Every structure is written in C-alpha cells, then in structure tokens.
C-alpha cells in the first residue's frame, strides 16, 4: 500500500507512417506545489526504444535503474548485443509489464503509468501502455492522466484507425503532439510549459529533443472578459 508523493503528469504518444512519437513535460509536482522543474520523464533504452513514465517519480527512478541494468545484463556473453540480439521494444515492455503486475499482486505497486514507444527490428511500430494495476493495451494513440481525456481526442482526429497510419507523416504527427502539449498546458493544473519530445523512426533512428516550450498561445481574448455575469467594468 502506497501513496504517490512527487508526481509526473501526462505522457502522450502516437504512431505515424515510419515510426512513433512520444512526449512528456519536465515537471515533478509535490501535490499542488510545482516543486521540481528539471525532471526528464522520457528514458531511452538503446537506439530503438523510449519509455515514457508518469506517476510517482521515486518509482520512476527505480524503473530507470532496472532498464539501465537490463541493458548491462543483455550485453553479458552476447557478441550480437548491438545487432541481432539487441533489446527490442517488445522485450523491454513485457519485462516492465511482468514487474508491474507482480508488484500489484503483492499489494505494493509501482505507482506509475508507462508508455513504451519504439520500432522493432523488422521495422514495425511498437506502442503499448502499462500501469500500476498491470493493465496493458495498445492503440494508434496512447496517453496517460489528463492526456487520455484531452490529447487522445485530438490525436485520434489524425489517426482514427490502423489504416490512417501510413497516411500520416512525421511532420503532421509531431504538429499534433505539440498542439496537444499546448492544450494540456492550458487545462492541466499540474503541467508545465517546458517539455521533452522523442521520435523513433525506422529510417532516421532515434531523435531526442530536449528543452521544448509551448508557444503560439492564445491569451489576448482575456482582456475582454469582465466580471462573472452582470458587471460591465
């Protein structure tokens, strides 16, 4: 039995024609206090996988260590560690999914929601979700927390089903992700303006973008809003 202390909010992601995009803001909240501002919640594993984590940050840092150790363990007695027998996104996910469910079954969960985004060896896009309960699911778009309520609706307008994936370019996909991050900044009280974004492409590989900011915001209309009903001044 836990309660989460220092927390991270939404992680959002989607598939596009050649790969996957994933994003998450750099905030570590302490209840209503926006305590920590330099927190990286996207963690790359190799050059083909990115694990995005929301929820308890102490448990996130534990998972970081496990993934770090997983890379080391895989390299042991493995001449093809950087080739055929390298870590796949599906391997990394199933490992985490096993841990998450084992921990919930011991009534001592890792208080997180996790999205494993990556590209398989055969070029296939990988995007799957797992949380503190051990529940897993996959979809063209995946999001955690407030992202599930606000980002998914926007991202599903671009990729509504499987057949929309080949029709979606990396430019269009990233534009939707960046827009979703702005909407979350408007409406999620535990979000920040600063965020990170990662693209895993089957051709161009892993591109990790840090220190992005929400921009092109609409606030001007606020000056016209006066009172809460009758008030004219």
């Amino acid at each position: 039995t836990q309660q989460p202390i220092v927390t991270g909010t939404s992680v959002i992601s989607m598939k596009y024609d050649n790969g996957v995009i994933i994003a998450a803001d750099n905030l570590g909240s302490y209840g209503s206090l926006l305590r920590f501002n330099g927190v990286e919640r996207l963690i790359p594993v190799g050059d083909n996988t990115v694990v995005g984590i929301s929820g308890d940050i102490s448990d996130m840092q534990h998972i970081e260590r496990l993934l770090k150790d997983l890379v080391t363990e895989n390299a042991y007695d493995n001449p093809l560690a950087d080739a055929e027998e390298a870590l796949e996104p599906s391997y990394i996910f199933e490992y985490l999914a096993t841990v998450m469910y084992q921990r919930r079954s011991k009534m001592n969960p890792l208080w997180n929601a996790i999205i494993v985004a990556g590209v398989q060896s055969n070029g296939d896009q990988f995007l799957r979700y797992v949380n503190l309960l051990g529940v897993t699911y996959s979809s063209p778009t995946l999001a955690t927390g407030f992202g599930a309520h606000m980002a998914n609706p926007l991202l599903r307008k671009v990729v509504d089903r499987e057949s929309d994936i080949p029709k979606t370019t990396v430019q269009v996909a990233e534009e939707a992700i960046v827009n979703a991050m702005r909407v979350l900044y408007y409406r999620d009280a535990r979000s920040s303006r600063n965020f990170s974004l990662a693209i895993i492409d089957k051709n161009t590989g892993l591109t990790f973008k840090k220190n992005l900011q929400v921009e092109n915001m609409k606030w001007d209309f606020a000056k016209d809003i006066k009172g809460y009903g009758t008030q004219k001044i």
Binding site: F146, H149, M150, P153, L154, R187, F221, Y228
Partner: protein
C-alpha cells in the same frame, strides 16, 4: 453528456449530444438537452436529467411572467441571476450544470452555471462528462471573429469529440443558433452520424408462438 457554447460575429450558438444514461445503460438514444427559457434565450443542460429540466422550466416560467410584467424582451443575465440564486440556495443538491446563451436588447451572451451556483463568462465553454474532449477541440480550433457557419462547425466538432471519445456521450448532435436581429433556429438532430445498421435477421414471430391463458375485452368508455 457533452454540451458546448460558442460565440460568433452577430450572436451565439450552443450544441449538445443526445445520449441519456442510467448507469452503464443507454436509456434514451435521442433525448433533447437544448431547452428554451424564452424565445431567444436557450439552455444546454448536463448532470441530473430531472433537475436540468425542472430548473430550466421554472426559471423559463418566471422569465415569461417577468417579460409580461415589464413589457420587455427578457435578458440572459436575468435568467442567469435567477438560475444561480436558485441553485445556490439548494447548496448543489439540485444537480444542474447549464450553459446559458441568447440574444436580447443588450446584445449576445454566453454563460455557464454549475450546480453549487457559480457562474462563468466566456467566448467558448463546455460542460458535462465529455467536456474535456470537447474543450480540447475548442482550445485547438477556436479563434476570435468566427462567422455563423464557422461557429456551428466548431460547436458540432466539439460535440463529436465527446460523442466518439466519451462513453457518457453519444448518438446525435443538436444545435441552436441565436443571431442578433433574427429568430433563433433550433436545429434538432443537426447531425446523425450513428445510424443503426440493418439487422441480419427479422425476429417477427409466427402468430400463436406465445402461450395464452385468458383473453378479455377492456372497457375504456364510460
């Protein structure tokens, strides 16, 4: 429910889905959530279904009597004031969440009211279980100086986001356009994107399938 309100050039537009739930069960697949308070003041309602209907009819009645008494067309702020003071008096127990909109001699207006009696002003608003899906669309596509046709499109798109992504919302899209100097047009079932497909089989029974014990003619006349 998903309900929205959007201001435009010469007026205001409100919209709503048409699903009514009873737990996880869909009770009414095509209920009307847009309510007429006065001819040019309309109301979208979310929350407890009986409460939204009852509170909107009561204030609508009192607005009519007020309009006759003062020899004036009713104002949106009057409906707003009367609704919020009623709801506040009952401390949230009347579970009515409303988007109030309309045109009057002062101009065009758009407000929201919550069950506890707080009111908000805005150019675009959304209430209900699918308000987050709708607000995501409104935040992405809204701009200043919308036309009539652009506002209807934006409003219906916001409702659609709720229909598809929120389990609490579904079925059709109702719309009401309130433009200054014109009659308000109530567009019942403006979109119907959830038509039931043809069934695979007819379940019309052969006559006599049901076993009967007694028959009798009922007297309805005097």
């Amino acid at each position: 429910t998903t309900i929205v309100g959007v201001k435009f050039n010469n007026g205001v537009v409100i919209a709503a889905d048409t699903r009514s739930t009873q737990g996880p069960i869909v009770a009414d697949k095509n209920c009307a959530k847009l309510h007429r308070i006065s001819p040019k003041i309309w109301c979208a309602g979310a929350g407890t279904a009986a409460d939204t209907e009852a509170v909107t009819q009561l204030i609508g009645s009192n607005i009519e009597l007020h309009s006759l008494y003062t020899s004036r067309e009713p104002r949106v702020v009057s409906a707003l004031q009367m609704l919020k003071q009623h709801l506040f008096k009952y401390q949230g127990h009347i579970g009515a969440y409303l988007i109030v909109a309309g045109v009057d001699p002062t101009g065009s207006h758009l407000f929201s009211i919550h069950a506890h009696g707080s009111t908000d002003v805005g150019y675009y608003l959304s209430l209900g279980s699918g308000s987050l899906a709708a607000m995501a669309v409104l935040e992405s596509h809204w701009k200043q100086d919308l036309t009539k046709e652009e506002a209807i499109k934006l409003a219906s798109d916001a409702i659609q986001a709720g229909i598809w992504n929120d389990l609490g919302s579904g079925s059709n899209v109702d719309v009401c356009v309130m433009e200054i100097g014109k009659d308000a047009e109530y567009l019942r079932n403006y979109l119907t994107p959830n038509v039931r497909e043809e069934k695979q089989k007819s379940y019309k029974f052969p006559r006599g399938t049901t076993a009967v014990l007694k028959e009798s003619i009922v007297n309805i006349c005097d």
